[PDB]
């Protein structure tokens with residue numbers, strides 16, 4: 001269709017403007033990567049509970065990392081930042097966002113409605129209302145259009161892998177959404193069918209397989225280590241029949257790169 | 258916010274009330290869109306969130322300019338450039354004389370420009386009707402009201418069904434299609450194009466079935482040749498009267514051969530065969546185009 005190339009070009013611009021500061025965690029005095037991991041895993045569950053789009057999750061993670069790029073947050077307020085970000089993402093992305101009352105209830109009354117509504121206003125202030133961010137998801141949906149024929153296991157697996165990268169800020173904050181999406185597509189394609197990053201996508205993205213290697217090295221490791229990981233919600237989510245049970249598939253032992 | 262002196266209410270544009278106001282220090286005339294946050298409600302409305310984030314990246318001469326966002330605990334104001342009137346009112350004032358065609362042609366060309374900018378930045382307007390389109394004294398026309406707008410993905414997902422003001426609503430929404438995209442906005446512009454030409458609304462329905470039938474009565478009831486898949490759409494009924502298509506010479510009499518070509522392309526039943534705003538800009542109807550001034 002008529003706009004696919006323009007939109008890609010423009011999402012490629014925006015991802016660079018929308019990226020968080022890569023080492024912001026080192027300058028956070030209370031919160032850690034493990035804490036951010038526990039929070040993102042929690043939001044996976046919240047999204048499963050409220051039947052939210054994968055996109056809504058991806059957006060929320062973007063808003064959280066950008067918020068924490070410029071704002072020092074104590075551990076006891078991290079979940080408040082996450083909850084207001086989930087709320088904003090939902091209002092942005094969902095046909096039916098959950099109400100503030102349900103957001104308050106899934107935190108088990110850790111925070112008040114007021115506190116959620118006041119964090120919402122802070123997050124919008126800090127993000128200067130710039131909520132429409134490219135995500136690994138958005139790149140992945142476009143890349144799917146280059147698989148012949150459409151393979152639903154490859155699609156579920158690439159998403160599963162794209163979602164795994166959200167949990168771990170070291171190393172994945174280093175990588176743009178379009179890169180993680182390419183690495184995820186390739187890895188999924190390779191695991192399911194033995195195929196590789198297609199020539200049509202090398203042309204569209206300008207990313208050679210080689211250029212994807214650093215992120216693919218990482219993501220292969222994350223895949224291999226996935227059942228051993230302390231955060232397990234994405235793997236649970238991806239056992240269900242709607243995702244063809246792809247988290248139960250065996251990762252490939254080597255990539256040949 | 259004490260830098261503004263309110264001049265008058267100039268309407269309730271949808272989910273906000275709009276005021277004309279003046280900056281007391283620079284003298285700038287602005288439109289204010291007041292969005293109350295009650296208290297202990299749902300927070301910032303999802304329509305304000307969308308409108309602001311989408312508008313912040315829709316910077317085009319044919320899209321209304323957001324100048325500021327004033328963000329209190331108690332209230333939320335959007336500050337816009339001020340434009341003279343909306344197209345609905347301009348059209349009502351011209352109900353007797355008629356809009357001159359070089360200006361109809363200028364306005365549509367501009368609308369398509371602003372719309373193509375939206376689409377190529379992954380935005381669906383979803384509410385293009387004459388009252389949401391703004392004009393100034395120097396012959397510019399701009400897209401406004403992005404409250405009902407949406408950042409879309411490639412390929413699209415299912416989005417809200419309750420979308421587009423009935424008269425300007427596309428058949429694929431009315432027939433309950435699972436997916437709609439940018440074509441719903443072209444549809445709306447085609448109806449606006451026709452309305453500028455004939456001085457009245459092309460399809461002024463009062464219920465969904467009535468909106469559909471008026472569409473069918475003008476353009477023919479669609480079949481599988483005209484639109485592969487229609488007879489399989491959720492709200493399609495094989496009992497629909499099968500009306501033949503009206504010649505555009507009766508439909509839109511004041512219009513030339515090029516005018517009819519473009520209009521029929523904007524009103525194609527098949528959303529996939531319906532002309533894009535980019536392709537529309539390249540149509541022979543615009544070979545001739547100038548930038549005339551409105552005649553109040």
Ligand SMILES: N=C1NC(=O)/C(=C/c2ccc(-c3ccc(S(N)(=O)=O)c(C(F)(F)F)c3)o2)S1
Nearest residue numbers: 267270288337338339340341342343346401402
């Ligand atoms: N629905 C809307 N959303 C906006 O952002 C709007 C901004 C805006 C700027 C100027 C106007 C506007 C609209 C209608 C009209 S109207 N109804 O023609 O009176 C006018 C006025 F100048 F003529 F008074 C101005 O709206 S309107």
